[PDB]
Amino acid sequence: AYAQFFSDVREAEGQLQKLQEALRRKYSCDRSATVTRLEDLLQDAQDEKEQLNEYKGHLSGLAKRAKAVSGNQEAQEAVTRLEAQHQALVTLWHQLHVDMKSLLAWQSLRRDVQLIRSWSLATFRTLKPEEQRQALHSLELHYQAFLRDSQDAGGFGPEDRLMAEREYGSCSHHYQQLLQSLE
């Protein structure tokens, strides 16, 4: 009778391990990942996220069966060992998730900073005010997102927020300088 149970335990033990390797393989991104790809992977991650939630009822089901089995302590110590293993995945999923968001914000903020800093007075004049203001809308959107999502991100730190502010203000300054020439 313990066989049918411990077989299910070993089966459940394998799926979580398989799920761990799936997370690492799919969502370990670096600073060479494009914006479009990061966005795609971020919504893909939700599918893995939903499996983890549905696995709670699977673990609880084994927790019950574990109780209704001498060496019952071992049967319960095994399920407990799985719940610890499962929480690690949720913790891992969130870490990978918040890492991808930080990269996404960062990659976007780079596109904006480059764009705005590429402006010269001759290029600026050919632009409509709606187009000028738009580039600064996109700048603050991705700047403020970066300060927010880089916090729990392991790939970025306070020095990267320090620089971001500098790169951001850099463009605000350039913008303010370009406007002061047209008036």
- The CATH number for 61's domain is 1.20.58.1060
Which DSSP symbol is given to 152? S
Pair of tokens at residue 141? 């959107």
Into how many domains does the chain fold? 1
Method in brief: X-ray
Residue 71: C-alpha distances to residues 5, 61, 76, 80, 169 (Å): 13, 19, 9, 15, 65
> What's the one-letter identity of residue 121?
L
- The domain of 9 spans 1-182
What's the start-to-end Cα distance of the chain, in Å? 86
- Two tokens, residue 101: 């968001």
Encode burial over 61-98: b for 16+ CB neighbours within 10 A, e otherwise. ebeeebeeeeeeeebeebbeebeebbeebeebbeebbb
- Contact (CB, 8 A) for 117 and 167: no
Q: What angle do CA 75, 77, 80 make, to 5 degrees?
A: 115
Pair 121, 181: CB distance under 8 Å: yes
How distant, in Å, are the alpha carbons of 117, 118, 145, 173 from that of 129?
17, 17, 24, 17
Phi (first) and psi of residue 55, to 5 degrees: -85, -15
Resolution (A): 2.8
